[PDB]
Amino acid sequence: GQVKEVTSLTNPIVKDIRALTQKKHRDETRSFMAEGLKLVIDALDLGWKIKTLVYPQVEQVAAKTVARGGLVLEVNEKVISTITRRDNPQMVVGIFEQRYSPLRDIHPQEGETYVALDRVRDPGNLGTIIRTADAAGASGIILVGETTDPFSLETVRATMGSVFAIPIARANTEDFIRWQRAAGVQVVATHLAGSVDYRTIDYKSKPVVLLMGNEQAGLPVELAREAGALARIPQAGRADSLNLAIATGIMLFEARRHLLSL
Amino acid sequence: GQVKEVTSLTNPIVKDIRALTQKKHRDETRSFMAEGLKLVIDALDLGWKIKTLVYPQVEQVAAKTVARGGLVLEVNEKVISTITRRDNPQMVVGIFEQRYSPLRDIHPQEGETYVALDRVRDPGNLGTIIRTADAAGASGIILVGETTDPFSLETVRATMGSVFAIPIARANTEDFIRWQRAAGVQVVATHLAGSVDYRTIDYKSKPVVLLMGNEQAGLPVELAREAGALARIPQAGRADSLNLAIATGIMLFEARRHLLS
Ligand SMILES: C[S@@+](CC[C@H](N)C(=O)[O-])C[C@H]1O[C@@H](n2cnc3c(N)ncnc32)[C@H](O)[C@@H]1O
Ligand SMILES: C[S@@+](CC[C@H](N)C(=O)[O-])C[C@H]1O[C@@H](n2cnc3c(N)ncnc32)[C@H](O)[C@@H]1O
Ligand SMILES: [Co+2]
Ligand SMILES: [Co+2]
Ligand SMILES: [Co+2]
Ligand SMILES: [Co+2]
Predict the structure, then answer these.
(1) Per the CB 3.0–4.6 Å rule, which of A19, A42, A165, B143 could disulfide with A25?
(2) What torsion, rounded to 10 degrees, do the Cα atoms B105, B107, B112, B115 define?
(3) What are the structural domains of chain A?
(4) A141/chain B closest Cα distance in angstroms
(5) CA-CA distance, A251 to A255, in Å (whole number)?
(6) Distance from chain centroid for Cα A223
(7) Chain A closest CA to B50's CA: distance in Å?
(8) b/e burial code for range A95-115 (CB count within 10 A of at least 16 → b)
(9) What is the DSSP letter of A165?
(10) Which of B124, B134, B234 has its CB closest to that of A239?
(11) Are B10 and B18 in contact (CB under 8 A)?
């Protein structure tokens, strides 16, 4: 591992960091960007492999990074804001290895809640859910089907650090359903056509998987079908539906009402 | 000729719509933009004054427009691109008169819930809160002190039409405190300081006001100094805060738990 320095833009490897805003480029190295000193330090504790650092506690983190076998860049405010695309950047920005938990490795125990998101489209919605699931003491996020990337800069920002603190996993519809049966869980699907008050449900007996639907479309039958309980939050207006993240928060804290205290 | 067409983007009739991006123009013209036909209809059905209407049921809408003294505009999909600042946007756009409820015209009755936001800065947060508060069946939003603007296009998008549906007042800390002290309400302020568990509060006796804090600071002591109760939602982790809108949604559904089904 090694240190380096640059101020010009083109210098191919600085177009390499820039391009971590694109999925196709992030995926070509299983890699992603996160901003902030406090944050990179915390993500290092949670055991995340750092590939590059960008920038006095920096000395020890750079040491930890170069000694871990990867690049480190002393750099001006013009470069840092251009890669983070903000006029008013942070001084320190880490690049890290993406990691998902494989779904087969996840074994729901008593007392645990999971959030499964069928085809989540909006990045902020996802990042906010990840943050909120973390806050509720849930044990992970399961991204079912084609969703937005959890490791986009837009989504990573919205987590406020929680991307590093709660397991994320991804699966096609079939494997998830296979898993969801074998796991011995109370599957709680949510629909705007659901029959039962989310408050009237048993979240105590079994580990729970909260199944949330797509923003435009809601849950497709193939997953709706599986519900051990088809729940809905009562509303009272013109309003069609709740925002996805909002709904997920409402459910997180009902589902763990008995477990959260002061 | 209220039924009127334009192709040119040079036309000053267009660059004055684009000026609605600016808050100056928005505020000094008392107007704002809203996208989509089912909005533009339901806002018409909700009694809103449409100034301008750009673009099957469209004819029935351009009628209600002109009947109420509103100008109409036929323009190409690329004119609608440049006003909106959007890829692929809706066929219709509507420009309306802004509508704030004066605070002292609000009379908190029994079984009603109001949300008050101190210094909300994020357009999305607000937009969503407005949405969530419509859905929880709350009687109105109260914006306290310097906030992002609820009639901005960003915030309007995030309400998904709920901006037309729930009244919005605005006030500085003084006016708010004045009205509050008179209006006879249970002010439940979300804090972490003097705070009790949010599921233990009495939300039945007095019409409730939920007073949520600023995304960075949180509530300023002078506001929390006049709170009937201080509520906190318990959490688990290094994660110190809930997103404001998330916190507000949770509070809303606890505050109206006894009322919703
Ligand atoms: C924006 S919504 C979906 C809207 C839905 N397709 C419709 O228009 O009929 C996104 C998701 O949030 C959740 N959601 C929203 N409102 C809800 C409610 N009252 N009860 C349960 N879930 C809700 C559901 O999981 C839903 O699939
Ligand atoms: C993101 S917070 C900022 C709080 C601030 N960081 C602090 O140190 O208090 C925005 C506001 O949302 C509300 N909020 C967020 N999490 C909350 C919780 N767990 N309980 C009650 N209110 C909360 C509060 O009104 C808070 O002032
Ligand atoms: Co590349
Ligand atoms: Co639907
Ligand atoms: Co002007
Ligand atoms: Co704080």
Answers:
(1) A19
(2) 50
(3) 1-100 (no CATH), 107-262 (3.40.1280.10)
(4) 16
(5) 6
(6) 21
(7) 20
(8) bbebebeebeebebeeebbbb
(9) T
(10) B134
(11) no
Identity at B257, one-letter amino acid code: R
A-to-B residue pairs, Cβ atoms closer than 8 angstroms? 99
Among B91, B90, B96, B80, CA closest to B14? B80
Instruction: With CB atoms and an 8 Å threshold, state whether B131 touches A253.
Output: no
Do A136 and A260 form a contact (C-beta atoms < 8 A)? yes
Query: What is the least distance, in Å, from the CA of B196 to any CA of chain A?
Result: 8
What six digits make up the tokens of B113? 């819930």
Resolution (A): 2.9
Give residue A32 CA to ligand 3 midpoint distance, Å: 13
To the question of whether residue B80 is assigned a binding role by annotation, the answer is no
Please give the full DSSP string across A91-103, using - where no structure is assigned. S-EEEEE--PPPG
Tokens found for residue A12:
């191919």
Strand A93-97 versus strand A50-54 pairing type: antiparallel
Residue among A121, A201, A241, A243 to mutate when testing ligand 1 (max atoms within 8 A of CB): A241
Chain B residues in contact with A36 by the CB 8 A cut-off are none
Q: Experimental technique used?
A: X-ray
**Alpha-carbon span A66 to A3, nearest angstrom:** 7
> Could you tell me if A18 and A86 are in contact, meaning their C-beta atoms sit under 8 angstroms apart?
no
Spell out where A76-147 has E strands: 93-97, 113-118, 140-144
Ligand 2 contact via B213 beta carbon (within 6 Å): yes
